[PDB]
Enzyme design. Sequence first.
Site, PDB file in Angstrom:
ATOM      1  N   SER B  39      -3.072  13.515   1.245  1.00 53.18           N
ATOM      2  CA  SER B  39      -3.005  13.684   2.665  1.00 53.18           C
ATOM      3  C   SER B  39      -1.272  13.653   2.735  1.00 53.18           C
ATOM      4  O   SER B  39      -0.914  12.523   3.288  1.00 53.18           O
ATOM      5  CB  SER B  39      -3.255  12.405   3.093  1.00 53.18           C
ATOM      6  OG  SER B  39      -3.226  11.486   2.664  1.00 53.18           O
ATOM      7  N   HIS B 159      -9.240  11.210  -0.225  1.00 49.23           N
ATOM      8  CA  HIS B 159      -9.061  10.226  -1.348  1.00 49.23           C
ATOM      9  C   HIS B 159     -10.502  10.332  -2.629  1.00 49.23           C
ATOM     10  O   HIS B 159     -10.795   9.674  -3.979  1.00 49.23           O
ATOM     11  CB  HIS B 159      -8.760   8.766  -1.214  1.00 49.23           C
ATOM     12  CG  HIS B 159      -7.250   9.251  -0.676  1.00 49.23           C
ATOM     13  ND1 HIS B 159      -6.549   7.825  -0.520  1.00 49.23           N
ATOM     14  CD2 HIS B 159      -6.461  10.080  -0.867  1.00 49.23           C
ATOM     15  CE1 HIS B 159      -5.493   8.157  -0.176  1.00 49.23           C
ATOM     16  NE2 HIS B 159      -5.100   9.577  -0.238  1.00 49.23           N
ATOM     17  N   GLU B 168      -8.858   5.291   4.275  1.00 45.65           N
ATOM     18  CA  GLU B 168      -9.077   3.941   3.922  1.00 45.65           C
ATOM     19  C   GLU B 168      -9.463   2.877   4.783  1.00 45.65           C
ATOM     20  O   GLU B 168      -9.402   2.739   5.864  1.00 45.65           O
ATOM     21  CB  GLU B 168      -7.503   3.526   3.431  1.00 45.65           C
ATOM     22  CG  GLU B 168      -6.445   4.819   2.999  1.00 45.65           C
ATOM     23  CD  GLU B 168      -5.189   4.548   2.310  1.00 45.65           C
ATOM     24  OE1 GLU B 168      -4.557   3.822   2.518  1.00 45.65           O
ATOM     25  OE2 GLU B 168      -4.022   5.402   2.147  1.00 45.65           O
ATOM     26  N   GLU B 211      -8.008   5.779  -5.346  1.00 42.94           N
ATOM     27  CA  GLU B 211      -7.270   4.959  -5.092  1.00 42.94           C
ATOM     28  C   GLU B 211      -8.176   3.428  -5.396  1.00 42.94           C
ATOM     29  O   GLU B 211      -7.629   2.494  -5.817  1.00 42.94           O
ATOM     30  CB  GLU B 211      -6.996   4.388  -3.686  1.00 42.94           C
ATOM     31  CG  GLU B 211      -5.579   5.606  -3.442  1.00 42.94           C
ATOM     32  CD  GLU B 211      -4.665   5.272  -2.185  1.00 42.94           C
ATOM     33  OE1 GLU B 211      -5.201   4.122  -1.662  1.00 42.94           O
ATOM     34  OE2 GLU B 211      -3.683   6.294  -1.948  1.00 42.94           O
ATOM     35  N   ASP B 246      -6.477   3.258   7.378  1.00 41.12           N
ATOM     36  CA  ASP B 246      -5.697   3.901   7.450  1.00 41.12           C
ATOM     37  C   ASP B 246      -6.513   5.554   7.447  1.00 41.12           C
ATOM     38  O   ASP B 246      -7.322   5.497   6.894  1.00 41.12           O
ATOM     39  CB  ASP B 246      -5.015   5.228   5.849  1.00 41.12           C
ATOM     40  CG  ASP B 246      -3.839   5.933   6.158  1.00 41.12           C
ATOM     41  OD1 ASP B 246      -3.875   6.256   7.562  1.00 41.12           O
ATOM     42  OD2 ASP B 246      -3.250   6.005   5.525  1.00 41.12           O
ATOM     43  N   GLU B 295      -3.374   2.456  10.900  1.00 43.00           N
ATOM     44  CA  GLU B 295      -2.323   3.677  10.155  1.00 43.00           C
ATOM     45  C   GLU B 295      -2.964   5.296  10.695  1.00 43.00           C
ATOM     46  O   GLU B 295      -4.153   4.959  10.404  1.00 43.00           O
ATOM     47  CB  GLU B 295      -2.102   3.782   8.640  1.00 43.00           C
ATOM     48  CG  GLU B 295      -1.115   4.487   8.658  1.00 43.00           C
ATOM     49  CD  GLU B 295      -1.360   4.115   6.930  1.00 43.00           C
ATOM     50  OE1 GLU B 295      -1.483   3.493   6.143  1.00 43.00           O
ATOM     51  OE2 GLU B 295      -0.546   5.233   6.185  1.00 43.00           O
ATOM     52  N   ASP B 320       2.540   6.708   9.225  1.00 46.19           N
ATOM     53  CA  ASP B 320       2.992   7.239   8.384  1.00 46.19           C
ATOM     54  C   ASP B 320       3.209   8.675   7.873  1.00 46.19           C
ATOM     55  O   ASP B 320       4.354   9.076   7.901  1.00 46.19           O
ATOM     56  CB  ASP B 320       1.200   6.734   7.213  1.00 46.19           C
ATOM     57  CG  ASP B 320       1.544   7.565   5.862  1.00 46.19           C
ATOM     58  OD1 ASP B 320       2.665   8.020   5.204  1.00 46.19           O
ATOM     59  OD2 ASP B 320       0.387   7.374   5.038  1.00 46.19           O
ATOM     60  N   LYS B 345       7.429   5.130   2.412  1.00 45.30           N
ATOM     61  CA  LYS B 345       7.604   5.996   0.926  1.00 45.30           C
ATOM     62  C   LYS B 345       9.103   6.057   0.061  1.00 45.30           C
ATOM     63  O   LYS B 345       8.953   7.993   0.998  1.00 45.30           O
ATOM     64  CB  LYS B 345       6.347   6.617   1.156  1.00 45.30           C
ATOM     65  CG  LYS B 345       4.833   6.392   1.789  1.00 45.30           C
ATOM     66  CD  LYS B 345       3.836   7.759   1.836  1.00 45.30           C
ATOM     67  CE  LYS B 345       2.598   6.737   1.983  1.00 45.30           C
ATOM     68  NZ  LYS B 345       2.124   8.258   2.432  1.00 45.30           N
ATOM     69  N   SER B 372       4.166   1.607   0.770  1.00 45.68           N
ATOM     70  CA  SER B 372       3.015   1.846   0.252  1.00 45.68           C
ATOM     71  C   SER B 372       3.736   3.250  -0.873  1.00 45.68           C
ATOM     72  O   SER B 372       4.111   3.250  -1.399  1.00 45.68           O
ATOM     73  CB  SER B 372       2.571   2.910   1.211  1.00 45.68           C
ATOM     74  OG  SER B 372       1.379   3.561   0.964  1.00 45.68           O
ATOM     75  N   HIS B 373       2.532   3.082  -2.065  1.00 41.73           N
ATOM     76  CA  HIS B 373       1.943   4.219  -2.968  1.00 41.73           C
ATOM     77  C   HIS B 373       1.777   5.219  -2.438  1.00 41.73           C
ATOM     78  O   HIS B 373       1.463   5.767  -1.228  1.00 41.73           O
ATOM     79  CB  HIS B 373       1.148   3.135  -4.420  1.00 41.73           C
ATOM     80  CG  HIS B 373      -0.188   2.911  -2.379  1.00 41.73           C
ATOM     81  ND1 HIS B 373      -1.768   3.319  -3.418  1.00 41.73           N
ATOM     82  CD2 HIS B 373      -0.558   2.867  -1.841  1.00 41.73           C
ATOM     83  CE1 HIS B 373      -2.710   2.730  -2.833  1.00 41.73           C
ATOM     84  NE2 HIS B 373      -2.300   2.598  -1.426  1.00 41.73           N
ATOM     85  N   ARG B 374       1.423   6.304  -3.514  1.00 41.14           N
ATOM     86  CA  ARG B 374       0.476   7.600  -3.699  1.00 41.14           C
ATOM     87  C   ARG B 374      -0.689   7.523  -3.962  1.00 41.14           C
ATOM     88  O   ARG B 374      -0.926   6.849  -4.642  1.00 41.14           O
ATOM     89  CB  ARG B 374       1.657   8.510  -3.683  1.00 41.14           C
ATOM     90  CG  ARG B 374       3.267   8.722  -2.964  1.00 41.14           C
ATOM     91  CD  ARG B 374       3.394   8.719  -1.510  1.00 41.14           C
ATOM     92  NE  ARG B 374       2.457   9.605  -0.530  1.00 41.14           N
ATOM     93  CZ  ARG B 374       2.563  10.585  -0.244  1.00 41.14           C
ATOM     94  NH1 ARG B 374       4.370  11.029   0.096  1.00 41.14           N
ATOM     95  NH2 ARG B 374       1.491  11.359   0.879  1.00 41.14           N
ATOM     96  N   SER B 375      -1.574   8.562  -2.956  1.00 43.64           N
ATOM     97  CA  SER B 375      -2.537   8.622  -3.972  1.00 43.64           C
ATOM     98  C   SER B 375      -2.426   8.661  -5.574  1.00 43.64           C
ATOM     99  O   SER B 375      -3.499   8.858  -6.313  1.00 43.64           O
ATOM    100  CB  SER B 375      -3.840   9.289  -2.977  1.00 43.64           C
ATOM    101  OG  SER B 375      -3.597  10.100  -2.928  1.00 43.64           O
ATOM    102  N   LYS B 396       0.884  -2.032   0.388  1.00 45.32           N
ATOM    103  CA  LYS B 396      -0.692  -1.066   0.328  1.00 45.32           C
ATOM    104  C   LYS B 396      -0.280  -0.538  -1.229  1.00 45.32           C
ATOM    105  O   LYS B 396       0.468   0.250  -1.017  1.00 45.32           O
ATOM    106  CB  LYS B 396      -0.916  -0.531   0.831  1.00 45.32           C
ATOM    107  CG  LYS B 396      -0.809   0.495   1.650  1.00 45.32           C
ATOM    108  CD  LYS B 396      -1.344   1.611   2.293  1.00 45.32           C
ATOM    109  CE  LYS B 396      -1.241   3.032   2.236  1.00 45.32           C
ATOM    110  NZ  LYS B 396      -1.874   4.212   3.251  1.00 45.32           N
TER     111      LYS B 396
HETATM  112  O1  LIG Z   1      -2.922   5.363   0.363  1.00 50.22           O
HETATM  113  C1  LIG Z   1      -1.320   6.100   0.418  1.00 50.22           C
HETATM  114  C2  LIG Z   1      -1.104   7.419   1.310  1.00 50.22           C
HETATM  115  O2  LIG Z   1      -2.092   8.950   0.378  1.00 50.22           O
HETATM  116  P1  LIG Z   1      -1.424  10.210  -0.217  1.00 50.22           P
HETATM  117  O3  LIG Z   1      -0.695   9.529  -1.101  1.00 50.22           O
HETATM  118  O4  LIG Z   1      -0.251  11.240   1.094  1.00 50.22           O
HETATM  119  O5  LIG Z   1      -2.146  11.155  -0.594  1.00 50.22           O
HETATM  120  C3  LIG Z   1      -1.621   7.756   2.916  1.00 50.22           C
HETATM  121  O6  LIG Z   1      -1.899   8.262   3.431  1.00 50.22           O
HETATM  122  O7  LIG Z   1      -0.973   6.493   2.741  1.00 50.22           O
HETATM  123 MG   LIG Z   2      -1.527  11.115   3.385  1.00 49.47          MG
HETATM  124 MG   LIG Z   3      -1.219   7.321   4.937  1.00 45.77          MG
END
Ligand SMILES: *O[C](*)C(*)(*)(*)(O(*)(*)P(*)(*)(*)(*)(O*)(O*)=O*)C(*)(*)(*)(O*)=O*
Ligand SMILES: [Mg+2]
Ligand SMILES: [Mg+2]
EC number: 4.2.1.11
Lengths: 436, 436
Positions: B39, B159, B168, B211, B246, B295, B320, B345, B372-375, B396
């Site tokens: 996303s 996700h 999320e 995730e 999220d 978020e 984000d 990120k 933050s990580h990425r998915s 996160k």
């Molecule tokens: O949970 C991380 C991220 O998702 P992505 O990596 O963009 O699919 C978010 O939107 O916070």
């Molecule tokens: Mg995203």
């Molecule tokens: Mg996000």
Amino acid sequence: AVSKVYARSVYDSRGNPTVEVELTTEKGVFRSIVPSGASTGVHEALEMRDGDKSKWMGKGVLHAVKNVNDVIAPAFVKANIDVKDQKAVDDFLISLDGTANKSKLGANAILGVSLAASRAAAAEKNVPLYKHLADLSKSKTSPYVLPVPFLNVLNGGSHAGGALALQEFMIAPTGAKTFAEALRIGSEVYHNLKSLTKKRYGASAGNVGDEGGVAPNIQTAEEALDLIVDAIKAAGHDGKVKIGLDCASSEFFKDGKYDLDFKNPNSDKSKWLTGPQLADLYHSLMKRYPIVSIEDPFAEDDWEAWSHFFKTAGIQIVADDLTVTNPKRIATAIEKKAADALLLKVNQIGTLSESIKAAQDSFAAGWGVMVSHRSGETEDTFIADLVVGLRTGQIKTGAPARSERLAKLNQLLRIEEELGDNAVFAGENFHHGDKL
Amino acid sequence: AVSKVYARSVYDSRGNPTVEVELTTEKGVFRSIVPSGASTGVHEALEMRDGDKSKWMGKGVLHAVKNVNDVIAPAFVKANIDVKDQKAVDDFLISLDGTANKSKLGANAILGVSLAASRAAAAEKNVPLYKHLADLSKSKTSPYVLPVPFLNVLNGGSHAGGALALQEFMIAPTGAKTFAEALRIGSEVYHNLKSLTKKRYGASAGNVGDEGGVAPNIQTAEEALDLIVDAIKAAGHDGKVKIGLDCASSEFFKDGKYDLDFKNPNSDKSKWLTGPQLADLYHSLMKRYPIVSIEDPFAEDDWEAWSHFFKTAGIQIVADDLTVTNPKRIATAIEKKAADALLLKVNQIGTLSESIKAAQDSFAAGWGVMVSHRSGETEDTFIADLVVGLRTGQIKTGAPARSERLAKLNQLLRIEEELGDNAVFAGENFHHGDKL
Ligand SMILES: *O[C](*)C(*)(*)(*)(O(*)(*)P(*)(*)(*)(*)(O*)(O*)=O*)C(*)(*)(*)(O*)=O*
Ligand SMILES: [Mg+2]
Ligand SMILES: [Mg+2]
Ligand SMILES: *O[C](*)C(*)(*)(*)(O(*)(*)P(*)(*)(*)(*)(O*)(O*)=O*)C(*)(*)(*)(O*)=O*
Ligand SMILES: [Mg+2]
Ligand SMILES: [Mg+2]
């Protein structure tokens, strides 16, 4: 020389604590992490759990961690062992426990020390881990042999919620020319499978099991197999990709019978299969699908069933819970002609030395060896180096999804790159990759 | 001195290729791996993909890798850059690309070198990564601040397969007294959640999304939230665990309205909400549940909706996709009073330097910063050292399931151990951890 041995609690791929060990030498700090199974054979070496229901759902490893820190450590350091001498290292450890099943200190207290020493030794020798492992095992290294990865793309049994009894449905790109190719091919099949799975069984069907494979809620192996062959074809890889199974039959063995609805608390006993009945089921699958390997087709002590089926099975038969990476048990299986392949799990036995012996004995008997992860994995990549060192030609370390799986697969891409022309890909020779 | 810059393709947690880079100096070989979002915000720097539909479904990164090996590499080595000077590294990289969105080289080519340089620098300085990161960022380290982990225990949106729109559902153990405690509590809630979920919605509902969170096929946020609440209580952590969301609303913003059934190709347009109606839903959830953070409540360019909601939010509001770790956009969000926390990120912007600037600008405005990580994550642990270095107090990096998640969480356990009394746990002060 080893100046420190230290352990800590860390988390596995399922969110359960496990043991992480670090060994310090003049070469640095070497870290090794213990994996954890779910469908664990009754004969495996002891995985010591705290059993305190009030913490980590009774799965802490504080006891095991403490055994490393307070029992093994000081003693090990005092001993002043030569890490390069794996045997000496393991001997010391086994002696310290003094039990057949490593129930005194716990297998998960011993293992990480065992593995970490090997990393230290590789460093002392100034060679890559895989090369040191080939040394310890007296394996041929000219050339090295890279394994065909058996990717568990569709999860069942004890690894995924749903009705499906059989545990694992793997794809093996034996037709690839390189490991990199195999991985690409495997990933393409996987993506196609995920999409077909959601379409045929619903969006939730594409969500994953413990090992990263899709998890459709289906009652039969045929429904899983049909999806997989469809995915291979859609991806364009017909003829280069074969199938492997992990039945994990002990998980459904009750009253001398086999329950293919074992996850149903109110399963119909009248439907449970006899060993012969189950064998017939497998023959059906074998004749229809491009299956080239079947693991744990019968229960862990059901010797007669294994031997009987074996004489009729014209493909690789892998022993897992039957053998528990235990030379003694393997010897029984070898004499009984129960199987022709060993599934190697360092943590089923507890020491690297023992595991290597298991591999050697297997290869001596003309069997194959598939190095394996556990369903509870970590970021550790030991097994990648191990399967190369051992020259097996085959590994199972997950679907190409969930990093505790990719970490090994990625490590293997690094190894390949590094070796270049000094390595060949097992391909269709997977079964006897050691003899290549 | 840097003698070599090299990149290779590796696989992320979903089975897609990503870029792995290695920088070689007098100290060794330093490796960094690039994550990949699902996303992804429309304004994110460019993630370069090959688009060869016959290879990896068009998702190859060979072009990006080639960019590092054939373009960045030679220039970079020739330049004889001081890795400890992160700005110089980054300016070099930025200038070499010369495009606003790093579309010449690819942000995925650039980022690996940027991060690998910082690891090299830390080794040159003989300090742990997080300490070097604190230095680069002019952060206070006496004491260091450990973050509250926001665990995405229930997944939806882009996700996980299923009807659930919001992306999320995170638990945050702000009531824990140490990071290690927070992680334990979190895992316990997670186990209770998985079991409750299977019971309430069926076995398949316990399987996981991208995730690592459970993936029930449910229509509404209340259904998700009720599960979470129930799990918290069951685990016995009532009062020490809060909730974060999220929404990833850009993923369902169509024709100026919000589609809470966006995954249904036959979604009822008549049901799509307006900004104000959406805000009404959020307020209702905030009243009912122990939500401390939200978020992406509104779409990436729906400024007025953010602005309006923010007037009466009263909890942390994280930007984000609205900001995409871009200082210029952060400037706007601060100006319009749209939010009060930045989701950070590194791969949204492409360089460590610009990411540190983003954080600094945020803290300067009284905002909080959630690393933050990425998915689509890897076995890389950069973010763990980064959150500590920036002293944010909150991160996160997934559910406590799937090693691409645990790897980070384990690394924080390591850092915590190392620091001992030289660090404090953010706890209820997560929003302003930097000011602790
Ligand atoms: O949970 C991380 C991220 O998702 P992505 O990596 O963009 O699919 C978010 O939107 O916070
Ligand atoms: Mg995203
Ligand atoms: Mg996000
Ligand atoms: O897939 C590995 C293993 O499962 P565990 O780890 O015992 O749950 C198997 O049985 O091969
Ligand atoms: Mg098993
Ligand atoms: Mg097995």
